[PDB]
Design an enzyme around this catalytic site. Structure first.
Site, PDB file in Angstrom:
ATOM      1  CB  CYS B 119       4.842  84.842  12.745  1.00  0.00           C
ATOM      2  SG  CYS B 119       5.285  85.501  14.389  1.00  0.00           S
ATOM      3  CG  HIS B 255       1.932  88.056  11.618  1.00  0.00           C
ATOM      4  ND1 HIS B 255       1.548  86.734  11.682  1.00  0.00           N
ATOM      5  CD2 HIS B 255       2.432  88.365  12.840  1.00  0.00           C
ATOM      6  CE1 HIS B 255       1.821  86.261  12.883  1.00  0.00           C
ATOM      7  NE2 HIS B 255       2.352  87.231  13.607  1.00  0.00           N
ATOM      8  CG  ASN B 286       3.024  88.687  16.834  1.00  0.00           C
ATOM      9  OD1 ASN B 286       2.359  87.769  16.376  1.00  0.00           O
ATOM     10  ND2 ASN B 286       4.249  88.957  16.414  1.00  0.00           N
ATOM     11  CE1 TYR B 316       5.742  91.391  10.129  1.00  0.00           C
ATOM     12  CE2 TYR B 316       3.796  91.224   8.728  1.00  0.00           C
ATOM     13  CZ  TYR B 316       4.489  91.860   9.726  1.00  0.00           C
ATOM     14  OH  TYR B 316       3.925  92.978  10.315  1.00  0.00           O
ATOM     15  CB  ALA B 318      10.329  82.957  14.113  1.00  0.00           C
TER      16      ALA B 318
HETATM   17  S1  LIG Z   1       7.147  84.995  14.962  1.00  0.00           S
HETATM   18  C1  LIG Z   1       7.180  83.412  15.884  1.00  0.00           C
HETATM   19  C2  LIG Z   1       7.383  83.562  17.400  1.00  0.00           C
HETATM   20  C3  LIG Z   1       7.377  82.180  18.075  1.00  0.00           C
HETATM   21  C4  LIG Z   1       8.083  82.204  19.440  1.00  0.00           C
HETATM   22  C5  LIG Z   1       8.047  80.823  20.103  1.00  0.00           C
HETATM   23  C6  LIG Z   1       8.624  80.862  21.535  1.00  0.00           C
HETATM   24  C7  LIG Z   1      10.156  80.773  21.566  1.00  0.00           C
HETATM   25  C8  LIG Z   1      10.764  80.936  22.982  1.00  0.00           C
HETATM   26  C9  LIG Z   1      10.440  79.736  23.901  1.00  0.00           C
HETATM   27  C10 LIG Z   1      11.133  79.899  25.260  1.00  0.00           C
END
Ligand SMILES: *SCCCCCCCCCC
Ligand SMILES: *SCCCCCCCCCC
Lengths: 328, 331
Positions: B119, B255, B286, B316, B318
């Site tokens: 993110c 965010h 989001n 903020y 992943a």
């Molecule tokens: S906070 C970031 C969120 C990004 C998610 C990406 C998708 C991951 C799962 C793909 C199947």
């Protein structure tokens, strides 16, 4: 119109070290298929990672070696950029994973994707961040686990790609060590090197084929061989260096014949050392240039402080080039 | 040893414009969550969100947001020397999206790369662009957050089905009269990488595609606890670095992950009572890397914020990754 601070960092930045990691399994031309491969591409063997290894795990190892070679520990690093095409997760990014694996779980970092040219872009971005005062010392690591992406029935490219990782430490030097970045793309030829099926389409139709790397040979060869010399010249101009001052040339280890043509076009000294890591490393995409630098330094072919011209080129149709002083 | 030359760019850089693309499909809480038939709204602030069409991609939406950003700056593709695409939902290992985006705008040739930091992608991408422009590597750039998160969502995941969404928004970053982007404050918690994740890597999946597929997974309590604990400090570091006080901030753009986090942060940061706080989350959810610029876009469109208002941005997500900066509002 409240004041927002203007800041700056160290002006002279260069490569403090390089560290390289290659997986142990030697793979011959007779195993990645079903006499003229070497002739046509420059490749005899390559390294394949183990099942338990990943782009991220190999990045960690390369970074460890790069810190060791610099006389530094992880607490000395302000940030890490991972550059790759083979981190097989949409999220999380590999950079914080590497950061935590090195024992610096809190340092800034991100993943940079620009096909094979990712390293040149990532280097330039670290150089700019440090000079800008956003960091003082960084790791930049190219890492690739390409082995699982290869269709063993595709004689067009099955012998090309390979696995490995290499990291440079970037930080303040007494004199400029990293020249200006010359970069660009050709998005109209995005199909020339590609994953053939996007992951979501695949996941939504598992009875179909799985995705693999696909290459359009003539178009790639044509583009590289004929445009990369002009890119190299711009990199040399920008750095304020002449072709005859270049001690080491590190073209992307994509194909030996492309690289042979570039050398002649670039008008380098007869004694200019040209990276030929491809022969026993194959094409390691984003990891290619720093693996080649490490290899040249290991063998004695290059020495710290040599003037090196680096040219990355490949998928997306992206290129990134710059002149550097050899690290270690 | 002859010395390598250095180049130089603009000293003062800013957000010249923002351009926002929101796909037309409106999706209610009922539709995306199996378990629900109004508490999702109370608990998160999310009422609706947009979903891209099947034919649309993160790349296709980025192009659209870029066109709008350019028009909003009164500029053309001729004026752009670089493009950073920041995303988590470009579903190709290669080629990157940035060059195909550039071609789509008629600026084939121009440098570009994709940036992924969960993110927090946008703040890192904005930081990177400013750095590159000041370094002489470019004069004017596009930075575009874009996300097609809809196909990554498990409608049976009661913890996260309602969170994620699609959209794209771009900013034009270029030279300004006075400093417009403060220093970058960023960092990670790599030991919590599993907090937000793709649960099955693509290659492990490719070997057994008729078994379970990858979806986005999120440990919500863990993420809430970390954002609420950490982002106040992060915000203070960004203001400290920019040389500004909390009472000087006009617009707060955290965010759009959860409204309750964002309220707690307002109180924690000690912002002014009348500080405008981004709440795009209500109808946008989001959108990960697109969230901050989409939220900026929303505040400007409604006239809740004006171009030139002093803004605090905090991303903020992943990786456990975060990236923050003080900026002046574009448009
Ligand atoms: S906070 C970031 C969120 C990004 C998610 C990406 C998708 C991951 C799962 C793909 C199947
Ligand atoms: S020049 C960069 C080539 C990198 C290829 C990435 C692998 C694509 C195939 C995925 C199955």
């Amino acid at each position: 119109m409240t004041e927002i601070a203007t800041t700056s960092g160290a002006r002279s930045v260069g490569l403090l070290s390089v560290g390289a990691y290659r997986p142990e399994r030697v793979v011959t031309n007779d195993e990645i298929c079903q006499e003229w491969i070497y002739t046509r591409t420059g490749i005899k063997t390559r390294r394949f990672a183990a099942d338990d290894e990943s782009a991220a795990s190999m990045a960690t190892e390369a970074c460890r070696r790069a810190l060791s070679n610099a006389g530094l520990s992880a607490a000395d690093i302000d940030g890490v950029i991972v550059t790759t095409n083979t981190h097989f997760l949409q999220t999380p990014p590999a950079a914080p994973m590497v950061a935590a694996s090195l024992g610096a779980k809190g340092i800034l970092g991100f993943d940079l994707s620009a096909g094979c040219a990712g390293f040149g872009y990532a280097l330039g971005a670290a150089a700019d961040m440090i000079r800008g005062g956003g960091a003082a010392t960084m790791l930049v690591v190219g890492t690739e686990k390409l082995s699982p992406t290869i269709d063993m029935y595709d004689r067009g490219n099955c012998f090309i790609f390979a696995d490995g990782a290499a990291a440079v430490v970037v930080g303040e030097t007494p004199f400029q060590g990293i020249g200006p970045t010359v970069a660009g793309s050709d998005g109209e030829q995005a199909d020339a090197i590609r994953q053939d099926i996007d992951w979501i389409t695949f996941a939504q139709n598992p009875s179909g084929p799985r995705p693999f790397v696909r290459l359009e040979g003539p178009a790639v060869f044509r583009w590289a061989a004929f445009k990369m010399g002009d890119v190299g010249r711009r990199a040399m101009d920008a750095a304020g260096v002449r072709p005859d001052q270049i001690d080491v040339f590190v073209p992307h280890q994509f194909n030996s014949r492309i690289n042979e043509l570039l050398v002649k076009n670039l008008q380098l000294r007869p004694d200019a050392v040209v990276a030929n890591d491809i022969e026993h490393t194959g094409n390691t995409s984003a990891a290619s240039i720093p693996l080649a630098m490490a290899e040249l330094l290991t063998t004695g072919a290059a020495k710290p402080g040599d003037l090196a011209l680096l040219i990355g080129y490949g998928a997306g149709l992206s290129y990134a080039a710059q002149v550097v002083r050899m690290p270690k």
